[PDB]
């Protein structure tokens, strides 16, 4: 759907990775270090 689709608080500017918890994203961002 493309109507009132509540997004997310933290959305990685690198990829389409997003999570409601900052603690989670913090771990994902790390992946953006090796072979990237
Ligand atoms: Zn990312």
From Swiss-Prot:
Location within or outside the cell: Nucleus; Cytoplasm, Cytosol
Stretches annotated zinc finger (C2H2-type): 10-32
Tissue specificity as recorded in UniProt: Isoform 1 is strongly expressed in placenta, spleen, kidney, testis and peripheral blood leukocytes. Expressed in CD4+ and CD8+ T-cells, CD19+ B-cells and CB14+ monocytes. Isoform 3 is strongly expressed in placenta, ovary, tonsil, CD19+ B-cells and CD14+ monocytes.
Sequence positions that bind Zn(2+) 11: 12, 15, 28, 32
Functional summary from the UniProt entry: May be involved in transcriptional regulation. Overexpression causes down-regulation of a number of genes involved in the immune response. Some genes are also up-regulated.
Protein known as: Zinc finger protein ZFAT
Organism whose genome encodes this protein: Homo sapiens (Human)
Gene symbol of the encoding locus: ZFAT
Coverage span on the entire protein: 907 to 935 of 1243
């Amino acid at each position: 759907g493309s109507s009132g689709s509540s997004g997310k608080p933290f959305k990685c500017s690198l990829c389409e990775y997003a999570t409601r918890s900052k603690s989670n994203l913090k771990a994902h961002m790390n992946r953006h270090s090796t072979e990237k």
